Amino acid sequence: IKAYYAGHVLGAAMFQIKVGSESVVYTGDYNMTPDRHLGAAWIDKCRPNLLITQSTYSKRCRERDFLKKVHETVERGGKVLIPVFALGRAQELCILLETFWERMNLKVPIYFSTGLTEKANHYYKLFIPWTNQKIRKTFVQRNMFEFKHIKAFDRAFADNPGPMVVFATPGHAGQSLQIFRKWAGNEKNMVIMPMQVEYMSFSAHADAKGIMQLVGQAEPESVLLVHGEAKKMEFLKQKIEQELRVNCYMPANGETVTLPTSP
Amino acid sequence: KSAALHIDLCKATSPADALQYLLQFARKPVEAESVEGVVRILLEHYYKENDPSVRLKIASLLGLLSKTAGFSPDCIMDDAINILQNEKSHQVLAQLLDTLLAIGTKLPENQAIQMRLVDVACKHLTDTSHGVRNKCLQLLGNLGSLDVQKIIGDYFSDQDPRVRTAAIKAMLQLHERGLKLHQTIYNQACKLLSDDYEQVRSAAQLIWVVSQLYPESIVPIPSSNEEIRLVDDAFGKICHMVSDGSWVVRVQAAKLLGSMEQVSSHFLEQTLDKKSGACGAFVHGLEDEMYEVRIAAVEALCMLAQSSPSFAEKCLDFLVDMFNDEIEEVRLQSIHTMRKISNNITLREDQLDTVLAVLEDSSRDIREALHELLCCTNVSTKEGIHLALVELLKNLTKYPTDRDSIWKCLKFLGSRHPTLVLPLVPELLSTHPFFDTAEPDMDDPAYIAVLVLIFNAAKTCPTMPALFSDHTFRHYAYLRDSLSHLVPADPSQQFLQQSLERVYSLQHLDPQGAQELLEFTIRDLQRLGELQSELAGVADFSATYLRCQLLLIKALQEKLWNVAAPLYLKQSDLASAAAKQIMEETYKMEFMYSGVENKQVVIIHHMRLQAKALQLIVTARTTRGLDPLFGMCEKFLQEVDFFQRYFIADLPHLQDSFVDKLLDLMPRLMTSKPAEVVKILQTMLRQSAFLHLPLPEQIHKASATIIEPAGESDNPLRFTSGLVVALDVDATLEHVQDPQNTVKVQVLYPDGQAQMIHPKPADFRNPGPGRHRLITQVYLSHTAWTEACQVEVRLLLAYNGTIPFSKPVKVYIMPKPA
Amino acid sequence: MKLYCLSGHPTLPCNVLKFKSTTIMLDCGLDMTSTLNFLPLPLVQSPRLSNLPGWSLKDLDKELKECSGHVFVDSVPEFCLPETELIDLSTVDVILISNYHCMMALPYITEHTGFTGTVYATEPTVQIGRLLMEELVNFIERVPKAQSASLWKNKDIQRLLPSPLKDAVEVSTWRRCYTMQEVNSALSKIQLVGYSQKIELFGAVQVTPLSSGYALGSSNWIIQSHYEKVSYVSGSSLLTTHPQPMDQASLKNSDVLVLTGLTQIPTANPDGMVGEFCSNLALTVRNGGNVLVPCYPSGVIYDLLECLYQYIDSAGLSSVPLYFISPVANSSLEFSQIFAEWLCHNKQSKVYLPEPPFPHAELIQTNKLKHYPSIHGDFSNDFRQPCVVFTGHPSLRFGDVVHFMELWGKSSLNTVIFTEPDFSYLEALAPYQPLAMKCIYCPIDTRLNFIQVSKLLKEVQPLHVVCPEQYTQPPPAQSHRMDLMIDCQPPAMSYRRAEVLALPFKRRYEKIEIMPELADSLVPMEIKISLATVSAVLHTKDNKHLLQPPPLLSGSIPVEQFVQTLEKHGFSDIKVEDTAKGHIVLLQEAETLIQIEEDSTHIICDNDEMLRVRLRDLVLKFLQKF
Numbered sequence A: 001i002k003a004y005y006a007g008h009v010l011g012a013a014m015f016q017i018k019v020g021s022e023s024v025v026y027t028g029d030y031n032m033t034p035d036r037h038l039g040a041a042w043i044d045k046c047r048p049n050l051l052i053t054q055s056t057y058s059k060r061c062r063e064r065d066f067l068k069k070v071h072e073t074v075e076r077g078g079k080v081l082i083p084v085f086a087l088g089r090a091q092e093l094c095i096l097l098e099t100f101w102e103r104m105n106l107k108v109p110i111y112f113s114t115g116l117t118e119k120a121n122h123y124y125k126l127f128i129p130w131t132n133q134k135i136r137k138t139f140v141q142r143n144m145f146e147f148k149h150i151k152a153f154d155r156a157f158a159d160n161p162g163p164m165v166v167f168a169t170p171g172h173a174g175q176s177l178q179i180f181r182k183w184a185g186n187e188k189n190m191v192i193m194p195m196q197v198e199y200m201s202f203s204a205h206a207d208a209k210g211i212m213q214l215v216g217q218a219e220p221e222s223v224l225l226v227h228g229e230a231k232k233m234e235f236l237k238q239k240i241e242q243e244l245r246v247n248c249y250m251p252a253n254g255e256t257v258t259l260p261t262s263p
Numbered sequence B: 001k002s003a004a005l006h007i008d009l010c011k012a013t014s015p016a017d018a019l020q021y022l023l024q025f026a027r028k029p030v031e032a033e034s035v036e037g038v039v040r041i042l043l044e045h046y047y048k049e050n051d052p053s054v055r056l057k058i059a060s061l062l063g064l065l066s067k068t069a070g071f072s073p074d075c076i077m078d079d080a081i082n083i084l085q086n087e088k089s090h091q092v093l094a095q096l097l098d099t100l101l102a103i104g105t106k107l108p109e110n111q112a113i114q115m116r117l118v119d120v121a122c123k124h125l126t127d128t129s130h131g132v133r134n135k136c137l138q139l140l141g142n143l144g145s146l147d148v149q150k151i152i153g154d155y156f157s158d159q160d161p162r163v164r165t166a167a168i169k170a171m172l173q174l175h176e177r178g179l180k181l182h183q184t185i186y187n188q189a190c191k192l193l194s195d196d197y198e199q200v201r202s203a204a205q206l207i208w209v210v211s212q213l214y215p216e217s218i219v220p221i222p223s224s225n226e227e228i229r230l231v232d233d234a235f236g237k238i239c240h241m242v243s244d245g246s247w248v249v250r251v252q253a254a255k256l257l258g259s260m261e262q263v264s265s266h267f268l269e270q271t272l273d274k275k276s277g278a279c280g281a282f283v284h285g286l287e288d289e290m291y292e293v294r295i296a297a298v299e300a301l302c303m304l305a306q307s308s309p310s311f312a313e314k315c316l317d318f319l320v321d322m323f324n325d326e327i328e329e330v331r332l333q334s335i336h337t338m339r340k341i342s343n344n345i346t347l348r349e350d351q352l353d354t355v356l357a358v359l360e361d362s363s364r365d366i367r368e369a370l371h372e373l374l375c376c377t378n379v380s381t382k383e384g385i386h387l388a389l390v391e392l393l394k395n396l397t398k399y400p401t402d403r404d405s406i407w408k409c410l411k412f413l414g415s416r417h418p419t420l421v422l423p424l425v426p427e428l429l430s431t432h433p434f435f436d437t438a439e440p441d442m443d444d445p446a447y448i449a450v451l452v453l454i455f456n457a458a459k460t461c462p463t464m465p466a467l468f469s470d471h472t473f474r475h476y477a478y479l480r481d482s483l484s485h486l487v488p489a490d491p492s493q494q495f496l497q498q499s500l501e502r503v504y505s506l507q508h509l510d511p512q513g514a515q516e517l518l519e520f521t522i523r524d525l526q527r528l529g530e531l532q533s534e535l536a537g538v539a540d541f542s543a544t545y546l547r548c549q550l551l552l553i554k555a556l557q558e559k560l561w562n563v564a565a566p567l568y569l570k571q572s573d574l575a576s577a578a579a580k581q582i583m584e585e586t587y588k589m590e591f592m593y594s595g596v597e598n599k600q601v602v603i604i605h606h607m608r609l610q611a612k613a614l615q616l617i618v619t620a621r622t623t624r625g626l627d628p629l630f631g632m633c634e635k636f637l638q639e640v641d642f643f644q645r646y647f648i649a650d651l652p653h654l655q656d657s658f659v660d661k662l663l664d665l666m667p668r669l670m671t672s673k674p675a676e677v678v679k680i681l682q683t684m685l686r687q688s689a690f691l692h693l694p695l696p697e698q699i700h701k702a703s704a705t706i707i708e709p710a711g712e713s714d715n716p717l718r719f720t721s722g723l724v725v726a727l728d729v730d731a732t733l734e735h736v737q738d739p740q741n742t743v744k745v746q747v748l749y750p751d752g753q754a755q756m757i758h759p760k761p762a763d764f765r766n767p768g769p770g771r772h773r774l775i776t777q778v779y780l781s782h783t784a785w786t787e788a789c790q791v792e793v794r795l796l797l798a799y800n801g802t803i804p805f806s807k808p809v810k811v812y813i814m815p816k817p818a
Numbered sequence C: 001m002k003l004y005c006l007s008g009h010p011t012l013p014c015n016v017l018k019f020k021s022t023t024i025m026l027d028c029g030l031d032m033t034s035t036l037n038f039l040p041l042p043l044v045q046s047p048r049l050s051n052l053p054g055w056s057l058k059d060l061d062k063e064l065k066e067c068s069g070h071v072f073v074d075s076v077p078e079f080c081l082p083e084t085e086l087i088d089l090s091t092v093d094v095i096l097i098s099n100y101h102c103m104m105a106l107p108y109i110t111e112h113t114g115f116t117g118t119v120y121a122t123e124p125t126v127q128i129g130r131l132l133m134e135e136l137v138n139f140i141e142r143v144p145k146a147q148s149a150s151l152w153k154n155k156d157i158q159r160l161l162p163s164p165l166k167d168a169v170e171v172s173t174w175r176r177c178y179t180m181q182e183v184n185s186a187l188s189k190i191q192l193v194g195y196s197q198k199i200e201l202f203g204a205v206q207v208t209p210l211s212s213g214y215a216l217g218s219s220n221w222i223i224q225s226h227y228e229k230v231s232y233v234s235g236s237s238l239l240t241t242h243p244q245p246m247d248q249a250s251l252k253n254s255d256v257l258v259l260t261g262l263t264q265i266p267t268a269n270p271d272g273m274v275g276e277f278c279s280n281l282a283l284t285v286r287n288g289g290n291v292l293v294p295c296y297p298s299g300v301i302y303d304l305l306e307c308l309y310q311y312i313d314s315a316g317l318s319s320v321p322l323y324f325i326s327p328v329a330n331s332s333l334e335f336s337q338i339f340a341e342w343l344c345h346n347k348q349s350k351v352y353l354p355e356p357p358f359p360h361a362e363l364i365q366t367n368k369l370k371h372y373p374s375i376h377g378d379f380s381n382d383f384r385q386p387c388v389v390f391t392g393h394p395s396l397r398f399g400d401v402v403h404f405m406e407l408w409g410k411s412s413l414n415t416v417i418f419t420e421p422d423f424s425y426l427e428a429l430a431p432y433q434p435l436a437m438k439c440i441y442c443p444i445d446t447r448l449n450f451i452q453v454s455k456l457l458k459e460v461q462p463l464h465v466v467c468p469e470q471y472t473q474p475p476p477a478q479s480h481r482m483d484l485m486i487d488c489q490p491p492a493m494s495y496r497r498a499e500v501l502a503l504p505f506k507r508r509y510e511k512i513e514i515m516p517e518l519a520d521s522l523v524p525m526e527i528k529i530s531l532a533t534v535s536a537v538l539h540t541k542d543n544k545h546l547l548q549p550p551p552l553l554s555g556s557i558p559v560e561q562f563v564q565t566l567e568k569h570g571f572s573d574i575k576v577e578d579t580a581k582g583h584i585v586l587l588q589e590a591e592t593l594i595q596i597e598e599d600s601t602h603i604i605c606d607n608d609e610m611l612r613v614r615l616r617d618l619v620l621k622f623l624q625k626f
Ligand SMILES: [Zn+2]
Pocket: A008, A028, A029
């Protein structure tokens, strides 16, 4: 068993299975597009017999828009929170906001509520090698996951609003669900999730172009498509047939696939 | 002594001790005849010995000897090719091919030798060992000029990747030699691009070379019937090759892709968008996880935009995204490229607000980069200029130290956008339609910034000044006199020459007149140096020389010359102090001033010799033991001999001088007793002529000024005793010949302990010509003191002793107890 | 087949292995012992060194200075590099870093020699090596000193000089310190690979590092060619140490083994030494003195401070502060903390919980452990007299240790400890000999001792073993303890500095691949075992031999069965006769002659189509395809 870096989330990896001349590779969720705190998936020219992949589916421009909106809200003094359950996206947003505030040099507050976020921060700062190269290099200067934009007490929904950035992870009735009761009720008390609202969600999974790049790099004689919409995988399989004339598969749930091999 | 080497080699045991002896002989240097002998001895022992490692070492030593500059390697080349024909071991064969590389580099002129080397190289290329194949391919690449290209091209398909890398490197070397390449190499390299390994792909640079050589050449696609130029298909190759996962290969591909500026912009626009596999190549490059790849992509964008303006207009947005980049260096370089390509593009409100956003950032250097950008950027709407000004004023409030750069920005904004500014004049000056506004606070940063913008806008436009109030004109006059560089609308030499000529003509007066003239002239020279900074070098140089002459003259008129030696008393003596001062000033003349030629060094050393003679005279006067007189006189005669042998080519131009008269009397001085010789040299020194110092063409005095402690303060650097407190040192060094070696920082504790420090050559940095910055972190420690005390630090200019070099700065230190 | 050894040091190997169509440089291994001869570099110029006397020179005494009857070089310290001139370093393509200690002097080989290949290592080794290199460069450049003594290096002067300098070997090869720019240049060429990661070189050689267990990141390499395996052993530890436990199974069935990194002064027990060191510092603190512990920021200080905090918590002497001074002290501690995967199973169990691996982070949070980049960097303000200090280089020729021990040299109340088994402490104290300072030499050596490596060899049983000649001889300190003697049933040859060794292994068969159609071409026939023969074209790319389609004949025919078949076939003119020189039969059916003779055989067949077909059928009935 040999593992290869995936970069979908911290600790995510893709496995290369080999026995004799046989070779099977299964990746699950990955992404060619690097994250703000993670590296892109990399693999040699393994050229395996079979490849299993996901078919599910302006990043810097979206980041600029999100940062500009958050900056405008905090400059105006408005309070907006980001209710998100994903740990990887939450940590990426936390790193982005922390470095943005540090670069701007201002001292506006930003905190995170749930203790699970603190546990995730502890695991992240412990496991440096599974992150982006800037994190690894800046580790020499000082720890970057630690900052004045730390933990949240919030006087249990009694510390009032302000130029604040907060994170809540409900779920669907978990976490401090009273945050909505304390906040909102007016246009100024904005609450933005994926007075206005926009889709700040970042696509952790890569698009079809990333899958095309990976299959072009590895170049297996056969490919297997799972974990995605039916339309997406059908279109991707048709595009693979049109572009490469390389054998592929579209197995349904429980479908038995058999492949000949040359030992 | 080749016999010693021969017998030592013979006595040495063959298996082990021979290797050590040859290594020891190799480390020590060698001479031409010694090389010519030891090479034959090595060849004879190479024939005699049959071990692999020993023969390998002999081949390595042959290579080392071949690199000797003074040797004439002709027969040893013949013996080398002979043993090459006879050689069997592949490692030793590769070492001998290294020696052939050495000889080919040494002598690239002989055509017969070149063809002999290439034919024997291709003969030995039949060997199965990969190393000898690599060495032979290196020889083929190095040796060329008008079949070898086809031969190495056949070896492109070799199984060993190292041989393929050697082949492509040989092709690159051959191209560097300038030979005209073929076109079949393109498809061969295209085949090489599919190779698994990284060095082969990175080297296969070769397609860039062939694309540059024949960019207009038509090439047919193997599958598609359509015809595509070499430039475009090579561009597509590099585009879909950048997707490779080898980051070094990605950086190489991006860098060499930037060097291509002979391709149509339509194809670039097609391949840069997100909607073949060549789409979004630059999108992937700028989004790449390694900042090296992104920097290389930025450079490629710079070159291509300098080629095509439409592509630049298309790619502005991606550069704006790079202004949001998390790495600071990437942001800086992207901003610099945007500045480089701003001459044609014009921004929109989105671009302008995004650019002004990153200007808010805290780091000073990126803000300076934004300032450089805005100096050249275009703009369409007056509201863009208004936004620029408002964000710049916010920046003034945040970071006032950048005021000069922002004023430069507004200068360029006004000059390059005059018409677009003046509709915004009455709002910027806040002039009321009918009221008379209160006079704005002059010397304010923001108001000066606004005025600089307005005035630089008004330089071309004639309708602008009519909207100015009276106090605006008054402030215009104020700014114009104070900030002229921002706000828009030799008798001395010949005097110095004739003064020196006056001194040279009138030196023959009596001692009183000579002293008076010398005093007046040194005063005049000092005043000229103070008055004009250009001539300060020659002025201070001449002042030091004439002060040496004055000190020599005054010493010779002292009372002790007409009192017997027993009656002499050294408490009132001035000759010893005079000699000391002349010595120090001669050292200052020699080393402090830069640009001094040999014709000045001879006179400086002559004055030093006269000072040494005076020292000998006074020491003979004060002492009474014959033996110290004999020793001192012998040492002085040794110095005279050293001087006259050092400057043999200059004695005819020192007629009637002290050293000339000493040379005329040299045998008598050498033979005579200490009393007779000291008396005759004393009376000789009195009648010595005054040499005419030749003025250098250009000369500057060296000087340093410490600025990190500044003029200090009462505040002492408290710290525990015994431990060390580090003090920063900053100084501005000017016209120092070799500051990293000659300049030494010195710190004097308030006692006899005068610690000395040698700054490392790395810390010395050169911001501009004729000067040197010096950043040092000197470390100071001492035991406990009863109270805070002052510690002195000074710059010293070392030579081959040392002299003071700058004003002695001092700082207060308070080492607290344990 | 050929092994070149460059460094004569036992624990700092520098070896080059010529293996098939590739050559591997094993380790760099900077020899730091050379610096001991030079005068130390104080951070603040001490009066003692300035007033220190020179030494007589017939040919001019400023070149050398003498203290305590030992002449020292009064110039910048210089380092003994490996004998790199023996083999052209440009030729070699791969470098296999084993540990952060062995990768020292890598800038010299990467930059000066013109080496253009690749380098491999583990991530903790790379980071800790960067820390060590930058800190030593900082120590050298803090107080620059001129190269003011060169003439002493001549062999004549060396013979004229006493034993402490005459013992030095290859003084001419010594070099001044590299610069941080060269360090940045060298580390650019390195490639990061984790434990048990197979790396293929040009499709010919497989190389893999395995967990040595000595220090985190430290690895033992193996080299494989399927039918040939060469294993390289470096500093390893079987003790209950923090890193991931030493791997033993993977080194089995190894043809040639290379042994390096055995313990200096093997008699010392590290646990007892640590306990004694704790006792020494405890009594020093009880008397009110100060303890100086020169050591690297490596694993030694880590487990030392672990046992140390445990001991003082047991004894309740936690009042005194902890001072760890180094330019990369904070970085070293944080790097140790984050690298939790490379540690042992206990640490991995600990980090499964949210708590960090090591507990000194708790001390830092509670401020019971304190560290500073240097002395001047606010440590002076926060310094207190009764304390224990870890700082500087263990060679005592540079680093903050020089200033610290100069400060505390006079007072007998204070104490200085030694824990690094890499230098003779008597030589180290020689430039500082006239002192009342109490010095204790209690090194801690966690590497494998002689009995442990002997147990390892008896458990593995490799065919051959290679090691320096130092191991082959008993140590000079004892010269009588035959128990500390590496024992091997094979001869287990050795070498000296600049000694070239030829491997005894001479395996003459490599791997190849075959596609199924060639396999199906055979039709094996029972004999007693199966026999087969094929014929294919050889294709090789990237040292991967392949067989794909575009043989001798052994037709052992018994005489009696052949006679029976010939009689049954019905051919006319059959004559059988028994005469000398074997049986000879004349057949006039087609002018054919069959001759049978010992040690020979001749076959005659005409070109007639029918006769050819009959002969082919007859042979095919009793044809063995081999
Ligand atoms: Zn997933």
